[model samples]
Structure formats: C-alpha cells, structure tokens
Target: GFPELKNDTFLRAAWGEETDYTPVWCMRQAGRYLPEFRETRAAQDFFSTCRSPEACCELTLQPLRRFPLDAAIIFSDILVVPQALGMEVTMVPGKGPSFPEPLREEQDLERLRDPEVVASELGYVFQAITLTRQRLAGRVPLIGFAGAPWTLMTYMVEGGGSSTMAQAKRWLYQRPQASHQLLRILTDALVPYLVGQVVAGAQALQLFESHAGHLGPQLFNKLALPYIRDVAKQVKARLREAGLAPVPMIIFAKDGHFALEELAQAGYEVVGLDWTVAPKKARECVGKTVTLQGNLDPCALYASEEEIGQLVKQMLDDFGPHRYIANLGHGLYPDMDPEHVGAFVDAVHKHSRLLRQ
Candidate 1:
C-alpha cells in the first residue's frame, strides 16, 4: 500500500538536515484529483470513507500512486474528532464540514467523553493508523493529525465553518469560562488521540488550526495558543512515558500571521505560514529555530502550468533548501486542476535540488 514511501523523500527532508530532493506533496492530494478516487468517493460519502480504516488507508495512498509525494497523511478530516464525540457532522459537497448539533451548553459536553472514552469509542482511528503504518512498512512516514482545540471549538460553537467571527468571538468575549471548558476537554482528548496514532506507526504529527486566522491577536493568544501549547507539551510527555522520543510537530494556523510571534513562544518545532505571510518576513518573526511549511497560494493551481512552475520556483528561492517543506497555503480548492499540482511539485524539486548543491 505504501510501497511508494520507501526511501520517502518527504520524511527525510522534514527530519533530516538535508536530502536529495525537496520532498514535495500536495495539501489535498488524496481528494479532487484521480478519477478512481472521484468514483469511489461518489459511491459513498466522505465520512464513510474516512471512518473506515481500510478505506481511509486506501484513500491515503491514492495520490502517492499517481505522483511522487514525500509523505502520506492519513485519509481523514480534522472535523472527525467532533463527529466521534457524538455530534452530527457532515460534508455538504460545496459547503465543507457542518455540525447540526453544535455545542451550546453542558448537555452537549455530556455526550463526549475525554481521552479515555475516545480511545475506547473511536477505536477505528487507531486501527486505521496501525493498519496504515503496517502497510507503509516504515517507508515514507505517515503523518497523524487533528484539528487544533480552538479551531475545533470555533466550528463546534458556531455550528459550522464561519466566514466572520460572530458566534466564536461573542463566546470568547462574554463567556470565557464555557469557552475554556470546551478547549480543555478538546485538549485532553487530542493528546491521547494523536499519540495513539504515533504508537500505531505515524512518524510525524500536525496540528491543523484551520480557524486560527479569524481571531484578533489578543483573543488568539488567550484562547488558541494555550491549548495548542498544552497539546504539544502533553503529547511529548506521553511519548516520554512510553519510552519513545517525541515526534517533530508542525502547527498550521491558517491566515495566522498576527499570531506567529505567540506561536514562536508556544514551542512547536515547525509553524506553517499562509500565503499572506512572506517567507522572509516569517523567518524574521518566528526566528531561526523553527522550520516553515507552506504559503503557495491555492489559486496558483488555476494559472497556466508554466506560471505555476515559476511561482513555485520563486517560493523555493524565498524559503531556501534546509527548513522549508513546499506545500499549499491551504487545502486544495474543489475545482483545481490536479495536473497543476504535478507541475508545482516538479518545479519545487527542480528549483530546490539546485539549491542543495
């Protein structure tokens, strides 16, 4: 299943000081492209594919078969944590994740158990992780991930993906206690879930803070940064207890340029940048220790392949060879041309390999 991962270029680039190629991968590689995947997904919905371990693993390997990607992210969605907690979560094709029973009071909290409960109840994810790992056979590393606590809370409290910060901001504004409670429970649950993925064979981890950009600097610091810090800290502690070294952690707080300084203080080894933040400026803010992932505009896909190639080359020159992993600033748009992704990867490899010499 993971045969393509052997001597996987992406993992080496991420953990090793240097590598032969830049280790390029697409953000939504598993979805949107590949007619077979489109066919499989059309038969069943996204949640069904994600919930089933074998299906998810199959989907996880889909893009790898077509392109020489550096890593295989588990074919799962960040919103699944809430769905596992007993919310009615669905993907409405064009609309993305929607939660019908959005959390509003303590009663909603009663439906979800903490770490212990999720481990027992959502055992499918662990099974999938282990299965995916065995399938990979230590070839390119598998990345396990979860939605950041604040980001999950934003969707949970708001009832769906939000464009404006109305409900989420109001909760952070007027009801700090309730918001903190939600964040706390999610923080507790996230650590065990993520660590379990590693124990099952995932070699790396990413905390996807999809909604981080919506909040002001003050609110983001008080609300999101603490929970993210706690999750990273506790996962490392648990890894220590298990007699395993801590995994390299990457946090992608999309559109979160304002919070980069605070993220620097939070202790993750890698902080992802959205397209809005220039790579050089990010280095100045996050300082030298942190590795950077992403910032290729998703719209780059809509342009001609030559244009996309040139753009990727420019980004590679901006970030240089050692610490940057080339990636889209956000998930791929639904209508994006998959061939453009291949062109982008080729450009990254071509430009980046030159830098290594």
Candidate 2:
C-alpha cells in the first residue's frame, strides 16, 4: 500500500549489506536549524505540533526538501510515552520539558496507566509515521525512534534534563525494586509502540539511549542493557506474529562508549557511535557482525565548507564503506547554518564514494 522505495541504501547498510555510497542522515535533522521548521513550529505549541499529523509530516520533510538525506525520522518527543502513562508534561520555551508532578515515590507509580495500553494512546504517532512515509513517496526511507527506558525514567523522576541524574540514580540505588518495575513498564510499553511504527510504514527504527553515559558499566548492565535487549527482542517477535517484515533497528547511546560491547550484542542491526569513541575502538569492541553508524562531531558543521569536507573525508576513511551510515554523533544545534548542514551531507556522499572506488 506504500510507494516503491527508490532509495534503500540506508536499509541495505543497516543490515551489514552492501551499498554504493554510505547513506547519510542526521539525528534531529527535522529541528530548529531550518527557518521553515521554525515557521512551521511557530503555528502551534510543541506537543500540539507533535499531535498534528500534517504538522509533524511537514516538519519531518523540511530537511529532506533541502538535503538528500538517507532517512526521515518522525518528529516527536520521547516524553510522549510518559504523557501517555497519565502524567502531565509541558514544554516551557526556555526551560525545555517540565513535568508538573514527577513520580516522587512508589505510590506515584500507581498513577501510571497500564503499560499494555500505552501504545493505544500513541495513535497520533502512528498516524504521523504513515503520513510522513506517504509524503516522502519513497524519496528516502523514514525512520521511527523512541527514547530508551532509562532516559525516559530520568525525566519522569528528575522532572527534566539534569546535568547529573542524581534524583533518578537515587531512585535506582534506594528503590531498586521500583526502578526495575518502572523499567519493565517502559519496556512493555515500547515493544508494542515500536511494532506499531513498523506496521504504520516506518522503514527503519532507532532507539536512543540518550542518558547511557551517566551510569558505570555495572549499573548499566543491570538496569539499561536488559530492557534495551528486551525492546528489540519483543518488538521483533511481535512484528513476526503480526506477519510484518522486520525493519532494521538501530540503537544509539550517546556518550555510551563504555557499553559498546554490550550494545552491539543487544540485538540491534546497527550500533550508532558518538564522537567521543574512536571508530576503530568501536569496531574492535562490536566485532565484525553488526553494522555501524555515525561518530562525526555535530560542532564540525560550524567549520568552513572546506574544513567540513576535510573532516568528513577523514571520518569516512575511519568508518570505511561497508556496513556504515553517516550522521552527526549527536543532533544539530538550533543556531547552525543549513548550508553547512548541506555541506556535511554532500561531503559524506562525495567522500564515501571516493572510499568505495
């Protein structure tokens, strides 16, 4: 029922398959960097924009219209899951995401809606994915993503982004049972939510473990890795039962250099790396089976076009051609130049081609 996919480079490389030139896409590619995105975003409040399929579709395509990116990720916030769990969340202009009533104690966990029912409340995201995929018309594949459980729990406990997840970590240390309970709830919720994305037309999936670096390997192995593995395992199982072909899944843990070995074994097709980790070190850790994506510093875009290309050439050389995709180690910043972004995309294509030939 969807258009024929003209560009499968991203999907191909995702599965450790061959590709002509490495596919390129950026995290938060659809964001404040583009003036058009700002204009489209200005019409409604943040979450309202997220709820509107047309608005989200437009925002998702804004970057694609300008750059020949390999994929288009749906424009939505990770906080949506928490909101669906019956919490009230607001995005204050300068303050970012704020939760009026965070989960303060075990009793607060009772306020959450059943994790089984969470996906039903996220139909708007499903609608937006289908809408964006259709609008893309196979120009490039569309990716659907969600925040990993620990990252979501941080906001739910800390009430917002915290420099040190002291509050959430406090919960994990003081209330281990509650912490695991919340993680289990989040994993159950994410499984169906991700499967719905595939059924709704997402060609690829990404799980962002945004707060991974905060914990040591011991803590991460216990709390983060298990649920990350379950999300992939359960999502694939559900997709099979539904008679849907499994789309390639990518797991990116920012500043998560320490867990590279485990994340590679966590059942995702691709393991995305942040710039802090050397490409060679990551490849050695993950071994030869899984595909790799990213490691370019997002700040590199601020350099001149010549410098950007030079840096991209080196990055591409480091990652090589096979089983690779190009993307910023993190998301684009709000004040970045769109032309510079285009340069980054173009350089990736140009240099990746050079590496192939």
Q: For each candidate, what TM-score against the reference? A: 0.94, 0.99
- Candidate 1 whole-model C-alpha lDDT, 0 to 1: 0.81
What is the per-residue lDDT of model 1 for residues 150-184, given as tens digits with 9 covering 90 to 100?
Answer: 98888888888778968877888788888888889
Model 2 Cα lDDT, one tens digit per residue, 1-357: 999999999998999998889999999999899999989988878989889999999999999989999888999999999999999987888998999889979899999999999999999999999999888999889999898999999999999989999999999899999999999999999999999999999999999999998999999999999999999999999998999999999999999999999999999999999999988888998889999998899998999999999999999888878789999999999999999999999999998888888
**Once superposed on the true structure, which residue ranges of model 2 sit more than 4 Å away at CA?**
none
Candidate 2 versus the native: TM-score?
A: 0.99
lDDT of each structure?
0.81, 0.92
Off by over 4 Å in 1: 1-5
lDDT of 1 at 279: 91
Say which candidate scores most in TM-score: 2
The residue pairs found clashing in candidate 1 are 5-140
Per-candidate total of colliding backbone pairs: 1, 0
Give the range of the ten consecutive residues with the poorest summed lDDT in model 2.
315-324
How does residue 227 of candidate 1 score in lDDT?
Answer: 96
